[PDB]
Design a protein around this motif. Structure first.
Motif, PDB file in Angstrom:
ATOM      1  N   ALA B  58       0.851  -1.181   0.000  1.00 19.91           N
ATOM      2  CA  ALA B  58       0.000   0.000   0.000  1.00 19.91           C
ATOM      3  C   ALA B  58       0.892   1.237   0.000  1.00 19.91           C
ATOM      4  O   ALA B  58       0.592   2.225  -0.665  1.00 19.91           O
ATOM      5  N   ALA B  59       1.994   1.180   0.742  1.00 25.43           N
ATOM      6  CA  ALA B  59       2.914   2.311   0.790  1.00 25.43           C
ATOM      7  C   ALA B  59       3.676   2.450  -0.529  1.00 25.43           C
ATOM      8  O   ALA B  59       3.962   3.559  -0.965  1.00 25.43           O
ATOM      9  N   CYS B  60       4.005   1.329  -1.165  1.00 28.66           N
ATOM     10  CA  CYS B  60       4.733   1.388  -2.428  1.00 28.66           C
ATOM     11  C   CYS B  60       3.857   1.993  -3.517  1.00 28.66           C
ATOM     12  O   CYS B  60       4.340   2.747  -4.366  1.00 28.66           O
ATOM     13  N   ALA B  64       5.057   5.152  -5.517  1.00 23.53           N
ATOM     14  CA  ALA B  64       5.195   4.953  -6.954  1.00 23.53           C
ATOM     15  C   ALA B  64       4.449   5.994  -7.769  1.00 23.53           C
ATOM     16  O   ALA B  64       5.008   6.594  -8.695  1.00 23.53           O
ATOM     17  N   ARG B  65       3.185   6.214  -7.435  1.00 20.17           N
ATOM     18  CA  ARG B  65       2.407   7.171  -8.189  1.00 20.17           C
ATOM     19  C   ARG B  65       3.022   8.570  -8.141  1.00 20.17           C
ATOM     20  O   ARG B  65       3.057   9.262  -9.160  1.00 20.17           O
ATOM     21  N   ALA B  67       6.234   9.102  -7.347  1.00 17.20           N
ATOM     22  CA  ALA B  67       7.620   9.033  -7.780  1.00 17.20           C
ATOM     23  C   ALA B  67       7.665   9.346  -9.268  1.00 17.20           C
ATOM     24  O   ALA B  67       8.530  10.095  -9.720  1.00 17.20           O
ATOM     25  N   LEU B  68       6.717   8.795 -10.027  1.00 16.58           N
ATOM     26  CA  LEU B  68       6.687   9.041 -11.454  1.00 16.58           C
ATOM     27  C   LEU B  68       6.276  10.487 -11.728  1.00 16.58           C
ATOM     28  O   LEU B  68       6.656  11.058 -12.758  1.00 16.58           O
ATOM     29  N   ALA B  69       5.511  11.087 -10.814  1.00 12.37           N
ATOM     30  CA  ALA B  69       5.119  12.485 -10.986  1.00 12.37           C
ATOM     31  C   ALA B  69       6.374  13.355 -10.785  1.00 12.37           C
ATOM     32  O   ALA B  69       6.553  14.377 -11.452  1.00 12.37           O
ATOM     33  N   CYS B  70       7.241  12.942  -9.866  1.00  7.60           N
ATOM     34  CA  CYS B  70       8.478  13.667  -9.616  1.00  7.60           C
ATOM     35  C   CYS B  70       9.356  13.570 -10.879  1.00  7.60           C
ATOM     36  O   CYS B  70       9.973  14.553 -11.293  1.00  7.60           O
ATOM     37  N   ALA B  71       9.388  12.395 -11.505  1.00  9.70           N
ATOM     38  CA  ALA B  71      10.183  12.203 -12.718  1.00  9.70           C
ATOM     39  C   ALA B  71       9.653  13.024 -13.898  1.00  9.70           C
ATOM     40  O   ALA B  71      10.419  13.453 -14.767  1.00  9.70           O
ATOM     41  N   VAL B  92       9.640   2.886  -9.510  1.00  6.81           N
ATOM     42  CA  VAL B  92       8.279   2.579  -9.907  1.00  6.81           C
ATOM     43  C   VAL B  92       8.160   1.185 -10.521  1.00  6.81           C
ATOM     44  O   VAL B  92       7.377   0.348 -10.045  1.00  6.81           O
ATOM     45  N   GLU B  93       8.936   0.938 -11.572  1.00  5.11           N
ATOM     46  CA  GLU B  93       8.904  -0.353 -12.240  1.00  5.11           C
ATOM     47  C   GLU B  93       9.213  -1.497 -11.274  1.00  5.11           C
ATOM     48  O   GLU B  93       8.700  -2.600 -11.438  1.00  5.11           O
ATOM     49  N   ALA B  94      10.046  -1.242 -10.271  1.00  9.41           N
ATOM     50  CA  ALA B  94      10.374  -2.287  -9.308  1.00  9.41           C
ATOM     51  C   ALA B  94       9.199  -2.545  -8.352  1.00  9.41           C
ATOM     52  O   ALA B  94       9.149  -3.582  -7.689  1.00  9.41           O
ATOM     53  N   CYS B  95       8.256  -1.603  -8.305  1.00 10.40           N
ATOM     54  CA  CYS B  95       7.070  -1.706  -7.458  1.00 10.40           C
ATOM     55  C   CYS B  95       5.999  -2.585  -8.096  1.00 10.40           C
ATOM     56  O   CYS B  95       5.202  -3.208  -7.394  1.00 10.40           O
TER      57      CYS B  95
END
Lengths: 100, 99
Positions: B58-60, B64-65, B67-71, B92-95
């Motif tokens: 749930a935390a990942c 993730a959501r 993290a990709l926004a940061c990217a 993200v992909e590792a999630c």
């Protein structure tokens, strides 16, 4: 007095009660310690984003509140260390409502 | 183990974001918020992955959501800007296998 601050203050309180619980309660189980331990770290995250008035804080508060009540349910008890924790969690969950 | 891989990528993402907001000199206010928040989010996720918590997924999903926004907002031609986005997307992909 602002809703972010009241929620951050409540998160801080949830952190203390939770860490005291899993540290001092000699009758807690693995499950209960995992709940109180994760709830402490989750409230940490929330408080941190609340402080920075992050536009993402509410999303972090939602997740923390979700597990904070799950911690209040699993850790509640008649013992002081158990009710303090469960109570702080409830109070934190309550403080999130206005920010969602 | 997929969790170890995810925690490891979360650790790298935290490193990347921090070097960015601390060393980049072209960052805007919104990019710093994104990078800083992403760092804290991945931190929380790393902690739940370390203790192999049942709440880690749930935390990942939350880290993730964002993290990709940061990217999406931090990516750039400067090494620290590119490493920040690459590390974010790598986390993200590792999630995926955990979400």
């Amino acid at each position: 007095q602002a809703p972010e601050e009241r929620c951050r203050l409540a998160a801080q309180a949830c952190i203390r009660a939770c860490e005291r619980y899993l540290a001092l309660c000699t009758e807690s189980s693995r499950e209960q310690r995992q709940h109180a331990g994760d709830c402490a770290d989750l409230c940490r995250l929330a408080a941190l984003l609340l402080e920075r008035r992050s536009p993402w804080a509410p999303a972090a508060c939602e997740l923390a509140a979700r597990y904070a009540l799950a911690c209040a349910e699993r850790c509640d008890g008649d013992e002081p260390l158990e009710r303090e924790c469960a109570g702080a969690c409830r109070r934190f969950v309550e403080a999130c409502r206005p920010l969602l």
